[PDB]
């Protein structure tokens, strides 16, 4: 009864604080599915010390809330009372002063020291994974004959560049729809901002997270189904070549759906506003906060991330359940192979899924890590429950997979790869032109200084208002420049100082990431 | 006789226009030999290109240098003749008109061109090299058993982790050595421009040029012994930790040694010169001409190329001939044995040198090649003497080496892939900092404005001379300005333009050999 073991000590509710049978579960499931539950363990792990990290400069930041210049003053009546910004589409930045005490922690030297952290981790994450997966190979003996592979029973039926051309650009045009439909998210903040001031902009921003969240969840199952039609459609002479193709699409597919929101944020919102005379126009695209948007980014990665582990699991639990409850309605001794045939079959794909939704939520703690560290502990969370709730539903809810030889995880080991290239840059990205802590720290050590300051160390707005300067969230002129509303020396200085941290950060991180690929063997001394 | 025949149709200054045989190369000498050979040639086949490319951008900024606006205006009596630049240690543009002519081909957009182009071929170098190699392993057996290597006879002779870092630590010594004799020709440049000007810094650049390839010439003979004395001091368990081990070392060294005045000119000459108010001192940091010394690098990279290649195979045609003809004066019918062992053994090593000249070329022409275009040119001539001259050496005047199986170049390889990571960014800096391209683009597209513009579309100043007003390559503030003698914002912008285009350049790069190494396989079709 290997079965009744690996349900009672594992794959339950009950035994979700136990070690993971990787031996047992390698005899009966299969290399691939022992595979995937250790390297979900190996993250899990990682991300153990990623949270401790995360949690640590969080609450260096907390602690340091109260030594916050920025934000008591924005809190200070004296002075953020009489904070006069202009207009999005005359709100002061008292109602914001709260947001700025939330907002002092996420844009804080601690979060810089983090996302260096989270580059040397990202770097420690790979070498010991390659190195646990020889280690693997070696016990279990996944390296053997790799016979030429069967033709699929659909290529072999009709026995076609043409055809590869337009599946790109059918993938590409639907690449084209979701942006479209993130641009219909732009929208309707634009939409919905009037009749929510009618502060006004934090509801706004979350009902649009997570507005976004179910956007994506009801177009992952459409894309699932139109990628099936059209890799079917497609000729791959082998599996193999089918399994690649469906990989490249659904993770660009998938990559494009979850993080098209958090680039926008990221990099796209409040960037380009210009100043109040001649406003961009496409139309009048959405502006931002003093503090920048890592406020609004923080909130929908959160939002995104929570409501992906709650709900998602939750289906997991579920769909294979409520498909074998609507299998059993149909219709008391019964023996092995009714028990197991009234189960949903795994299908060829298999932990193809679940591989893609781990990497989504690698892609969401490293690439966008730089807005709050608390993401790897949530995330650890999520990847305790995901052991648990993938076990289940691969040995009570679906019937036995069979079992397949794979010596690594396959295309999504090159794909993390460069993910990881991508997401140092991001980070960097995200700390200057996201996170506004590079003109504060532009500020500190540049301004305070007596020669630029004084420490010794349709015209819609006369409708609108009876206002007579409003202050806006730009380093352009102010008036009595001789020419003003106008880039001046603060805003190039801003750019260089931001382009220079970018370049900086990029370079060392990445001989960092040599140095430690070097140093650090690809296979254990013990193997 | 295969010799007869391998030195009548090769190795033969006459027969320097002939395809090489490898296979029957790899017959004789054996597999290293013949792998070396072919990459030499292909090496010469790409830099063909290169250099055609090359030489078509130098002859579109000559025929541009007419209409050099600013070259003709340095040469313009009328305004040229009226520059004051204040002095290093008053001389006037004049003397430097020509150095303009032939500085704006330096600075060209045809070289920026270039410079992408050269990008784009060193992504293709590789992957073809590679595609060659599987060719070339397929074709040779090259793969074949790899059994346990013997231990060397000096490791077994004594039967460790203290030694290694003390070898480090004098290696380490011996770089800032190599650095301060640089940083000693930075020095002689100081002390020889006054009695030079007694333009003057044409000859004291071209004479500083010579003198630094003549020291890097006589230190590398130095290093070479005291790295194999070194490297026998430490203990390697096998011969090929060994070769890893001197490669490393050797390789460190002939690059610092090689590239730190390229280095020095195009990254720090004139970098940090302040203004002449409260100059840097350390002491009196050098400087350098409005255009930039984007000239003196390419004086000094023409002269070390030139000079390698004429001077080191003239060496590697006499040294051996030379031992031959000392050895015969040692002391008329003789046997195979006796002509063969009266010659220099060739040594474990082998090839190891011509491998380290051709990487040494090889970053000479990729991470310089944002100063002229011109340098494949000369390193194609470079490259086809090389093949003869290595041959001769390798078949009349050293013996036969014993054949050896290298199904690659070796360690070799990875340097050059690290070389390409580093000269993209590197030529992306030559052309931000080291060229002046970007501040005529910043004028050219946003100071022939109206409001920037007027264009529709100690003190031994006194004691050295009368004037009034010098003009300083800088962009500080003028006298007028509220903080004169200060960074302003010209200065800033250049500044964020620069790292923008770097960041711009590094990542389109980047990009670009991601997608042809994606594209590409690594392995022919026909292979
Ligand atoms: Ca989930
Ligand atoms: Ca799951
Ligand atoms: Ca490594
Ligand atoms: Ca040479
Ligand atoms: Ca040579
Ligand atoms: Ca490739």
Redesign the pocket.
């Given at each position: 009864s290997e079965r009744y073991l690996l349900y009672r000590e594992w794959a339950h509710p009950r035994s979700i604080y136990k070690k993971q049978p990787l031996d047992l579960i390698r005899k009966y499931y299969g290399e691939k599915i022992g595979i995937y539950f250790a390297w979900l363990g190996y993250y899990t792990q990682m991300l153990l010390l990623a949270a401790v990290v995360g949690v640590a400069c969080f609450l260096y930041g907390y602690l340091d809330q109260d030594n916050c210049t920025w934000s008591k003053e924005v809190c200070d009546p004296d002075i953020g009372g009489q904070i006069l910004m202009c207009p999005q589409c005359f709100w002061r930045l008292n109602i914001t002063c709260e947001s700025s005490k939330k907002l002092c922690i996420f844009d804080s030297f601690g979060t810089l020291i983090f996302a260096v952290f989270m580059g040397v981790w990202v770097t420690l994450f790979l070498e010991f994974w390659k190195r646990r997966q020889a280690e693997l190979e070696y016990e279990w003996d996944t390296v053997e004959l790799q016979q030429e592979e069967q033709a699929r029973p659909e290529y072999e039926a009709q026995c076609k560049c043409i055809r590869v051309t337009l599946c790109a650009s059918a993938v590409f045009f639907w690449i084209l729809l979701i942006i479209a439909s993130v641009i219909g998210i732009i929208v309707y903040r634009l939409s919905v901002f009037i009749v929510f001031s009618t502060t006004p902009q934090m509801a706004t921003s979350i009902t649009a997270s997570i507005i976004s969240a179910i956007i994506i969840m009801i177009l992952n199952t459409i894309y699932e189904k139109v990628a099936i039609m059209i890799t079917n459609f497609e000729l791959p002479r082998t599996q193999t070549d089918y399994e690649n193709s469906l990989t490249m699409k659904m993770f660009l597919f998938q990559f494009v759906n979850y993080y098209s929101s958090c680039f926008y944020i990221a990099f796209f919102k409040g960037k380009f506003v210009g100043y109040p005379g001649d406003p961009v126009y496409l139309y009048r695209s959405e502006e931002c906060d003093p503090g920048g948007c890592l406020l609004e980014l923080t909130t929908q990665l959160t939002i995104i991330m929570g409501g992906?582990?709650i709900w998602?699991?939750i289906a997991?639990v579920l769909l294979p359940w409520v498909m074998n409850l609507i299998g059993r309605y149909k219709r008391k001794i019964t023996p092995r192979w009714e028990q197991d045939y009234h189960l949903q079959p795994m299908g060829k794909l298999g932990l193809f899924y679940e591989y893609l939704?781990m990497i989504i939520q690698f892609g969401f703690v490293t690439l966008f890590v730089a807005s709050f560290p608390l993401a790897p502990l949530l995330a650890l969370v999520?990847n305790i429950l995901?052991i648990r709730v993938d076990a289940w539903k691969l040995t009570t809810q679906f019937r036995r997979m069979v079992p397949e030889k794979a010596q690594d995880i396959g295309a999504w080991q090159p794909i993390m790869q460069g993910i990881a290239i991508l997401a140092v840059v991001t980070n960097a990205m995200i700390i200057a032109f996201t996170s506004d802590m590079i003109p504060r720290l532009v500020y500190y050590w540049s301004f305070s200084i007596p020669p630029y300051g004084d420490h010794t160390y349709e015209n819609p707005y006369i409708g609108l208002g009876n206002y007579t300067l409003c202050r806006y969230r730009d380093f352009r002129n102010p008036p009595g420049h001789p020419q003003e509303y106008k880039h001046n020396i603060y805003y190039w200085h801003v750019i260089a100082a931001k382009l220079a941290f970018i370049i900086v950060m990029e370079h060392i991180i990445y001989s960092v990431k040599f140095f430690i690929s070097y140093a650090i063997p690809d296979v254990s001394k013990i193997t």
């Open positions: 992906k582990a998602n699991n997991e939704e999520n995901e």
